Symmetry: C5
């Protein structure tokens, strides 16, 4: 078949909607998420008009091969969607109602700056390319945009699923292209990061600071070096959950900063021992007593500064 012809010189308007049935597998490293959803399409084809009184039916059903259907695609998908047509309904004035159920793997960039206390705006870009015979333009039918109440994205809270109603119409390779932006707003469930990463990392750091109440060099070296190794393990664990970024993340900044605290603690432990061996313990004692206050204080202030810069 070929596209419906214009009454005059108007573009063909294709009304769209996406209804989310499942959202799963938000992969942070790949910056992808999987979706299973209804895609609804609506347009006018006057060649399909009929008389209700005469035909004795308010609606006709067609198979996809029998009529013209716009080639709708997703911009930001790995591979073309897996689609199954559910229904095609034609009303007497030639208004087509198309419904498919599809699944796809979507590429959408994530901003990790405030990880694990981050929020994201996932995008699903709908697109249509114009044909020689006619310009095709997309619109949003808001009554056919939504999500099922049970849609859960493990490790995330789903805030809203809306569409930017005005398309981005632009030229690509001498044809018009009409693009819509469907936006899925989500926020990370930071809860588990507290007992599993943040608090264990703070406990080992505070354990290293017990060295400031000890004159045993051998024990101090064991305290600071062992805890540092445990800190390295947490640093490695965290970076396996995340892609490499051309910026610092909030957690990355704290993790990095804690290395400086371990480094300065080793210097203090070394300086303390060196003075004692040199028969200057009163001086070592001044440095050690100051360290007992300076370490937790500088750690608290540095964290207030970091929280301020990031939030």
């Amino acid at each position: 078949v070929s596209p419906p012809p214009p009454i005059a010189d108007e573009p063909l308007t294709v009304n769209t909607g996406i209804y989310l049935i499942e959202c799963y597998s938000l992969d942070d490293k790949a910056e992808t998420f999987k979706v299973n959803a209804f895609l609804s399409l609506s347009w006018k084809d006057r060649r399909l008009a009929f008389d209700p009184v005469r035909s004795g039916v308010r609606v006709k059903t067609y198979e996809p091969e029998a009529i013209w259907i716009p080639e709708i695609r997703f911009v930001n998908v790995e591979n073309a969607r897996d689609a199954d047509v559910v229904d095609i309904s034609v009303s007497p004035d030639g208004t087509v109602q198309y419904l498919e159920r599809f699944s796809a793997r979507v590429l959408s960039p994530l901003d990790f700056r405030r990880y694990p206390f981050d929020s994201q705006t996932l995008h699903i870009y709908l697109i249509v390319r114009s044909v020689d015979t006619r310009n095709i333009v997309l619109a949003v039918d808001l009554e056919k945009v939504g999500k099922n109440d049970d849609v859960f994205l493990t490790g995330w809270d789903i805030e809203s699923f809306t569409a930017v109603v005005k398309p981005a119409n632009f030229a690509l390779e001498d044809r018009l292209e009409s693009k819509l932006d469907y936006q899925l707003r989500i926020s990370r469930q930071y809860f588990s990061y507290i007992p599993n990463i943040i608090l264990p990392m703070l406990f080992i750091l505070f354990i290293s600071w017990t060295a400031f109440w000890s004159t045993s060099y051998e024990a101090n070296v064991t305290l600071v070096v062992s805890t540092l190794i445990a800190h390295i393990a947490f640093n490695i664990l965290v970076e396996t959950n995340l892609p490499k970024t051309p910026y610092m993340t909030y957690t990355g900044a704290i993790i990095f900063m804690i290395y400086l605290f371990y480094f300065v603690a080793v210097i203090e432990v070394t300086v303390q021992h060196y003075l004692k061996v040199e028969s200057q313990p009163a001086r070592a004692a001044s440095i050690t007593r100051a360290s007992r206050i300076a370490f937790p204080v500088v750690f608290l202030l540095a964290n207030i500064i970091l929280a301020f810069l990031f939030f």
Copy 2:
């Protein structure tokens, strides 16, 4: 073809059944399981009625393209099911008997609160969408619901496979949708968690408590810090088997609590050494002797409280 027309104005009833052939790959992190099963369908199509005496046959066989078949889907699947039609049988009054064998990857949420002593209710949601010409509604044929005796789900015990007989009828995108809930009740085989995670974690903790029978600071620091690192390793091992949850799991709560015991043990070991160096060993000895009882007692009471809150 198109749907069978009503004798009057009754909905079309599609009777369903699921017979489980295989259940495998319950993935805790993804909250998925794979299934291989029979789907049986039954409905009345009077246009297919025939005379047995005349035709000389009690049953007719058809191919799926020759007749009308309801578009049955699963709600909570990653991709549409892989289905192969096994048989279509039509009796003289036009009763169709449909049988397919399918495989699918099912999304079903898991409650990890009592992990690894948890039970789950897996769901398989069957669905059909109504057409303009007719409301289509699902029912359960209980004689065609079951599972093969050999179905094993590795790491789990299978309790029951039943269906909620009344469908959930509701409107979605201006059509009626009829949804059935097939429920697979399972309970986790907690056995291996005992020798592999729980007991080793208790042994290292009890080893750290030997420090309460030692005056050697250097040895004490080695005992408590080394065992803490081993505890971190078990914490990391456990969290790799589990998704991130917006709540505490029973194992997660014990693991987290044990960190506090390691932390207080380091404080005690530090306080003991500090007093001895200050020439107050009699006092250090009072704190150490009290710790020998306080640590195991507070550990037992805290575990009784946790078990009570979770079970």
Copy 3:
């Protein structure tokens, strides 16, 4: 087409065979294995009989769509097999000879009780469902059962590939079902477990026992705790190669038992130090000297008991 009609009221016999071309990817955790094989089928269809003298040919060739073929399936496969038809030959009396080459992923439970010195019986279950017009029953053509000499399953020795010649005929959803059991007997190549897991695990344990020839508490704590951590690493390594079982495996039992030896060694090291500090070294020396014999002796006896219970 439809099934060949009975001369009287006999079931249709479908003769089967499986010839293994490749066996690969025995996955212990998933309890699966991949197979690539010939499936041979044979049955009588009298409607296809012809005269050899008249037709001037001993055999006719058909394409699968031209004739009736039984719907043969595998019970214990993840997804339906990937099949390609190789040949269909019809002899003058209407005997059909069918040959396909297929690949499949097979689910088959493994018994890990004697791991890594275990043997297994893998199963491939062939099945056919009877039709309304005729009962279909399976049989084994032993001349068409075997395996190629080069079939290798990495990490395993292949003993035999046989079929249980009598089918399991039973009712499932009001039709007869005919099931055959093809059995692939294999035994694990335990060799590499010796230099890679078993001996290293014994070496570190024996290294911990050097503490029974040392009065240095600090050194003893370092010896027993460090080796225990290495033992934890081997425990974790082993459990990553295995699924979770509702029973103890032989290796699992030894690994678990070794923890008790580490635990008692820490107690001995603690008791030794405590007595020396209390000015009772003669007594500490009695416990230490007894431990030098008791530890290796109790370890040898406990291993004889375990080997007896498992083998």
Copy 4:
């Protein structure tokens, strides 16, 4: 169909273009990247020429099976591309305009010599094989070569996407083959390697050098051995992100060199202790004081030499 015949002796020119829609999953170990793109093709088929006045349309649309289409393939892809035809447009003189959207996994070798400060030239090779009746040759339509502004390759900066306009025409198996080279120039975002690998590795190394301000052998052995183990962990982490190369990478060279510094530091710590026990501390003190300067100086010079040899 078969290829359009020559007016007189000339090869058939197929004009090509690639417009990149998505670039993702640059896998360093596999030396692959995934691409989603438009492929545009243009050629003259005079057998498809038509009269606009007669046919009643100015352009004709066809399906791929209705006309002759050149067999265009990619050289360096794992499997044949997943392609969906978007449009086939024929103008009155028989000029065909072909447009498909495809996705593919591309093999392209990477040079890791300057990792993680490396740049790469990824290739997509387009190819066509000549037929008996006609030589087919490829060209670039520069107006149809480009990339969307949002194309992001996580962990990389995209510099340019251009084509080498002259094809490589050559004989393979007695036929002409026409090959085009599309080049995607990228540079690695080295940023995250600094806080995550490089600085932590320098901190632990500098911590080992505190041993040059200590006379405690026991503490020195703990300092140098513990930090060496942490260095091994970083070496292992880095090599998991990279393939095995028959040459040294810049990071690999620094990592390897640091082992020599740990080795010499152990020798120094051993020599120091040996002299002190032999009652030669004045001499040990000379070696230790020299080491305080020699270690950081030789480390700085060796790094200047390495940076010079690699950049």
Copy 5:
């Protein structure tokens, strides 16, 4: 269609060739490699002979469904190859020239005895099964066997790609089967194993031997136990890259042997301490001084013996 009939009792010869376009993903653990290649086939079908003068064409082109094509398969593939037909050419005497491009995952056993200084012979087995009407036999057209100059197999050097010209003809299920052996000779790039595994493993071993220049038991235990743990880490790293073998590999033998050196070093360190505590240091000093020479000497001799047995 059906096979070309014999002039007189001679088998049909199918000439073959394989031209390698890409070799990738040699997976050591799975013993697989991926290939992308041309498969060329040639045979005589006299029923397709034509007169060039009469027909006015020197060559005819066909589609695969229009003529008889031999069912060529690969023996040692996971799944059937992904093939696309490029060209079918028929010359006037009825000589068919067939060309396809395919991709496949190939199973080929690897000999790890001399890992990582090993060479391998990968096999691609081509096969054809005879039909009732005709015996079919394979041959090699050497002019159509080759590889593109750019074919690279990451981590390997490609030496040669040749075919064993004489087929292996044998009976399987009462038909003749004709099998060709295409051989891809490769040698491992051992380079990176030196700086990444071999040298680090030697450095830690030599570090443990510093204990022979120390009288400090506590420091000695730290030196030998810490390095042993690092050795365990390298053993685990190496075994993750390799399948389990029923024989010792060269690297495996060195790794295993090094454990014995660590074990004897612990005995020496224990014996040294025991004698010193017993007031027999002169004797301890004799054992320690002998160990300084014995350890490196026995290590050198044992490595010469191992290299001799393996190479």
